[PDB]
Amino acid sequence: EFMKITISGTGYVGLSNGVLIAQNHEVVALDIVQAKVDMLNQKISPIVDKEIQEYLAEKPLNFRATTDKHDAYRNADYVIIATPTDYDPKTNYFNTSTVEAVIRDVTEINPNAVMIIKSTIPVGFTRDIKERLGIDNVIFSPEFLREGRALYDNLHPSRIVIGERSARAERFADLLKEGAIKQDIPTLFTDSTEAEAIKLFANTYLALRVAYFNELDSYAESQGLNSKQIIEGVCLDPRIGNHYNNPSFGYGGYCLPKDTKQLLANYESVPNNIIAAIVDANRTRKDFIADSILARKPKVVGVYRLSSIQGIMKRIKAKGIPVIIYEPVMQEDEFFNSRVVRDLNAFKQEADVIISNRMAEELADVADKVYTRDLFG
Amino acid sequence: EFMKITISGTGYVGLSNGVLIAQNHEVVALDIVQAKVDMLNQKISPIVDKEIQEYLAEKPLNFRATTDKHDAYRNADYVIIATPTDYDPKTNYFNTSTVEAVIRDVTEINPNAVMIIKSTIPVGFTRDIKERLGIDNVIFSPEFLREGRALYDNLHPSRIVIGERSARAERFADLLKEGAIKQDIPTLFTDSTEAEAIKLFANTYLALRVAYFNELDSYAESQGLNSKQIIEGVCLDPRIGNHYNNPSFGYGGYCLPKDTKQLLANYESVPNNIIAAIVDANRTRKDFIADSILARKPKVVGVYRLSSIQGIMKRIKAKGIPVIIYEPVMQEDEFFNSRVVRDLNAFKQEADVIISNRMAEELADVADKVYTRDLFG
Ligand SMILES: NC(=O)C1=CN([C@@H]2O[C@H](COP(=O)(O)OP(=O)(O)OC[C@H]3O[C@@H](n4cnc5c(N)ncnc54)[C@H](O)[C@@H]3O)[C@@H](O)[C@H]2O)C=CC1
Ligand SMILES: NC(=O)C1=CN([C@@H]2O[C@H](COP(=O)(O)OP(=O)(O)OC[C@H]3O[C@@H](n4cnc5c(N)ncnc54)[C@H](O)[C@@H]3O)[C@@H](O)[C@H]2O)C=CC1
Ligand SMILES: O=c1ccn([C@@H]2O[C@H](COP(=O)(O)O)[C@@H](O)[C@H]2O)c(=O)[nH]1
Numbered sequence: 001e002f003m004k005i006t007i008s009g010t011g012y013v014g015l016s017n018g019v020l021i022a023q024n025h026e027v028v029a030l031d032i033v034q035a036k037v038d039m040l041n042q043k044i045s046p047i048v049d050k051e052i053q054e055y056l057a058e059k060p061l062n063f064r065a066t067t068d069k070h071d072a073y074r075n076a077d078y079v080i081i082a083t084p085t086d087y088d089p090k091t092n093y094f095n096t097s098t099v100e101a102v103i104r105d106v107t108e109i110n111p112n113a114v115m116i117i118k119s120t121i122p123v124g125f126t127r128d129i130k131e132r133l134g135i136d137n138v139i140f141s142p143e144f145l146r147e148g149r150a151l152y153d154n155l156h157p158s159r160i161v162i163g164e165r166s167a168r169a170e171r172f173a174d175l176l177k178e179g180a181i182k183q184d185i186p187t188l189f190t191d192s193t194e195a196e197a198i199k200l201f202a203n204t205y206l207a208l209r210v211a212y213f214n215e216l217d218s219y220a221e222s223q224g225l226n227s228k229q230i231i232e233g234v235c236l237d238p239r240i241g242n243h244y245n246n247p248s249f250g251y252g253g254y255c256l257p258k259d260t261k262q263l264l265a266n267y268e269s270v271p272n273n274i275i276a277a278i279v280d281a282n283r284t285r286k287d288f289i290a291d292s293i294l295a296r297k298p299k300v301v302g303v304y305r306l307s308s309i310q311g312i313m314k315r316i317k318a319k320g321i322p323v324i325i326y327e328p329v330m331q332e333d334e335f336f337n338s339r340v341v342r343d344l345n346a347f348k349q350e351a352d353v354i355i356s357n358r359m360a361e362e363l364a365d366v367a368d369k370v371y372t373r374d375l376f377g
Numbered sequence: 378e379f380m381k382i383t384i385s386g387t388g389y390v391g392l393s394n395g396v397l398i399a400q401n402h403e404v405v406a407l408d409i410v411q412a413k414v415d416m417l418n419q420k421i422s423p424i425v426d427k428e429i430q431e432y433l434a435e436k437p438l439n440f441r442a443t444t445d446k447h448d449a450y451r452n453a454d455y456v457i458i459a460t461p462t463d464y465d466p467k468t469n470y471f472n473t474s475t476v477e478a479v480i481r482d483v484t485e486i487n488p489n490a491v492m493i494i495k496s497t498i499p500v501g502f503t504r505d506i507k508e509r510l511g512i513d514n515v516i517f518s519p520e521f522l523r524e525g526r527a528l529y530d531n532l533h534p535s536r537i538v539i540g541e542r543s544a545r546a547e548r549f550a551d552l553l554k555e556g557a558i559k560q561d562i563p564t565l566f567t568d569s570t571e572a573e574a575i576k577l578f579a580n581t582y583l584a585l586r587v588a589y590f591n592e593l594d595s596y597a598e599s600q601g602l603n604s605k606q607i608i609e610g611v612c613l614d615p616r617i618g619n620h621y622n623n624p625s626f627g628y629g630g631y632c633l634p635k636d637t638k639q640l641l642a643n644y645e646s647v648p649n650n651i652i653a654a655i656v657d658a659n660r661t662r663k664d665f666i667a668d669s670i671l672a673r674k675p676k677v678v679g680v681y682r683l684s685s686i687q688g689i690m691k692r693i694k695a696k697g698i699p700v701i702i703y704e705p706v707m708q709e710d711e712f713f714n715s716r717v718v719r720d721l722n723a724f725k726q727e728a729d730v731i732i733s734n735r736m737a738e739e740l741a742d743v744a745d746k747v748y749t750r751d752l753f754g
């Protein structure tokens with residue numbers, strides 16, 4: 001087979017999948033930003049990913065880009081939708097407008113193309129949109145990549161999951177396996193809504209794991225015990241393992257805080273204690289960490305690098321204690337009403353306690369006033 | 378070195394450790410039950426463990442037993458304490474009387490022996506007892522074996538943890554490594570109280586993991602989704618894994634229900650949400666399972682095999698629905714006021730719904746009225 005696969009959205013997800021598949025098939029990448037398309041046609045990547053830029057520039061890929069929807073979608077066997085979406089936990093609103101616009105466009109231009117959604121969507125999205133528009137050609141397949149290793153994670157994926165049990169779903173899984181470097185990749189075919197719930201449950205388990213080791217750490221600090229001794233002893237049980245067990249100021253990042261809340265909203269009519277506790281536990285852990293810091297009676301707290309550390313900052317400021325921030329990447333001189341100190345040495349002198357989620361070489365000479373719960377970094 | 382190691386308590390734990398060490402050193406096993414000692418001296422095991430009976434009967438072990446404390450403890454380099462203890466969650470009482478009696482006896486008879494406690498004790502026990510009696514010769518080392526594979530788990534241990542950082546603790550770890558079949562066993566030396574908390578945190582993580590996959594299963598049932606599809610997709614993430622993820626009526630057994638509660642009691646002054654939720658989650662899961670069963674409006678519920686299933690039974694009976702029990706191992710004709718039916722066929726005919734924690738071959742012909750959440754058994 002030599003198929004045509006269109007990518008809608010040339011960001012980390014679209015380009016990871018597109019470059020992977022362009023090694024063996026015809027890929028046409030569609031974006032709405034003409035300048036990104038022009039760059040791609042010059043074999044220049046519009047994003048930061050080593051492998052994508054290396055592949056685009058150095059390997060023979062049957063790849064091209066366009067802003068023309070008709071040129072992109074005509075004769076496509078599959079269209080991978082990788083446009084932006086966003087879930088807002090405060091309102092429980094999942095903005096899927098770009099995905100719905102693409103489904104609209106493909107349905108109109110090429111109703112025979114099979115759309116594969118890689119964008120994050122709410123649980124039940126695909127079953128519902130098919131029913132609403134009265135179409136059958138949409139399948140969800142979760143994307144497991146990490147930014148910065150976008151192409152790498154699809155060259156060496158943990159597994160491939162396609163949310164339809166059919167020969168056309170299997171042929172799509174084959175495209176992902178064919179472009180990968182890793183061999184005998186675990187492949188799983190499920191029904192739609194089930195596939196859409198996988199990442200929420202996987203990411204929430206990771207947040208649960210971090211929240212648990214953080215509660216173990218709260219206990220160890222409270223009791224004057226060596227947290228590393230306990231954690232290493234526990235994690236030597238092969239059913240538990242030595243990963244994702246490094247204490248911190250709370251789970252953070254781009255996915256976990258929102259996904260745990262998104263999953264909890266989905267449990268609104270399902271009795272549970274663990275799902276709700278995962279969200280509450282992070283707030284409790286931040287209160288514990290802030291209270292530990294405040295018990296040292298600092299006159300100035302220094303925050304070394306800026307994300308769960310933001311919650312610690314908020315709590316310290318709520319008690320009227322000034323916070324100064326060391327963050328080279330930030331160019332402003334203020335962040336949430338607190339001074340950003342550009343000079344590391346001045347920051348070190350002024351701060352009575354320096355908090356940092358993870359230890360860093362450059363804090364070694366002031367280690368005595370650094371508060372971090374990092375054990376394994 | 379060729380040392381003398383005394384075992385106090387010849388049950389699963391004492392005999393596993395004693396037979397292991399008797400392969401290379403002089404072991405004298407002490408019990409209070411003369412008949413168990415007499416059996417041991419005839420090379421007959423007083424417990425059910427294949428490897429222990431095989432080793433006792435067929436390998437050249439420098440092993441003997443006695444009820445004489447003086448004969449047992451004199452000249453011992455180490456005394457492994459493996460007497461019964463019990464934690465009662467209702468009262469938060471940990472009965473360590475047998476361990477304290479042995480410490481008393483050893484201190485009096487041979488104050489130079491180094492005691493290694495393998496019995497389960499409360500967190501902080503060893504530090505406190507040393508301080509109370511003004512002695513230094515007591516060290517806690519957790520025991521990770523499973524009944525039925527008692528000797529096997531010490532021939533192939535996950536890891537060895539000794540709750541003292543010293544050369545004498547290391548020499549004890551060496552005895553455990555020397556008798557084992559498994560090589561390069563992970564070995565960890567910690568301070569006392571830290572070692573004593575390891576199993577509670579490890580077992581509570583296992584209960585948390587089961588409670589989490591059970592909440593995922595509650596959601597799947599509630600939403601009409603295929604739980605196996607979701608769980609397999611999630612567990613293919615290598616940070617999560619395909620173990621301890623089989624839905625059930627709640628975590629049960631001999632250790633998890635009590636250890637989770639014991640750990641929660643230890644968190645009485647430590648802010649947390651996850652530790653308390655692990656206990657509450659099991660009650661919620663049992664309520665969900667019972668409610669699912671009751672929604673089928675059965676006139677008689679059959680319970681196939683008797684332990685979290687007991688909680689389901691209690692809840693069904695609380696609603697006035699009769700329960701019948703199929704449990705060949707039980708000889709009584711009543712269990713908690715419910716009929717025990719000896720004949721499997723009569724049990725099958727009468728029960729409108731048959732609940733079972735795990736599926737079983739012999740329920741195949743009535744599969745249509747069996748309710749089990751088992752996926753991987
Ligand atoms: N970045 C990540 O780590 C992961 C992201 N995802 C999901 O994948 C989707 C895309 O994420 P990214 O690749 O990071 O987005 P991105 O923002 O890096 O790239 C999105 C691209 O879509 C283009 N675009 C916007 N509307 C469009 C339309 N109607 N038609 C064609 N192109 C359009 C944008 O101009 C942009 O180039 C989101 O739903 C995201 O949540 C999934 C797994 C990992
Ligand atoms: N069975 C298990 O799965 C595990 C048990 N443990 C702990 O190890 C300890 C022992 O458990 P088991 O071996 O299963 O007990 P067991 O009940 O099978 O054997 C205990 C032995 O100690 C004897 N004994 C009682 N008082 C004594 C005394 N003052 N001096 C000498 N012997 C005495 C009893 O007669 C009996 O033979 C407990 O603290 C238990 O919680 C730890 C890990 C696993
Ligand atoms: O051992 C760990 C692993 C991860 N995290 C936190 O969980 C979130 C997700 O981490 P990652 O999977 O993006 O690396 C991040 O805030 C990370 O700091 C921890 O606190 N400890």
Ligand SMILES: O=c1ccn([C@@H]2O[C@H](COP(=O)(O)O)[C@@H](O)[C@H]2O)c(=O)[nH]1
Pocket residue numbers: 587620621622623624625626627628629630633684685
């Ligand atoms: O996948 C699993 C693994 C264990 N358990 C439960 O957790 C408790 C401890 O199991 P084990 O570690 O003794 O096998 C038992 O009630 C067991 O049924 C489950 O429900 N699902």
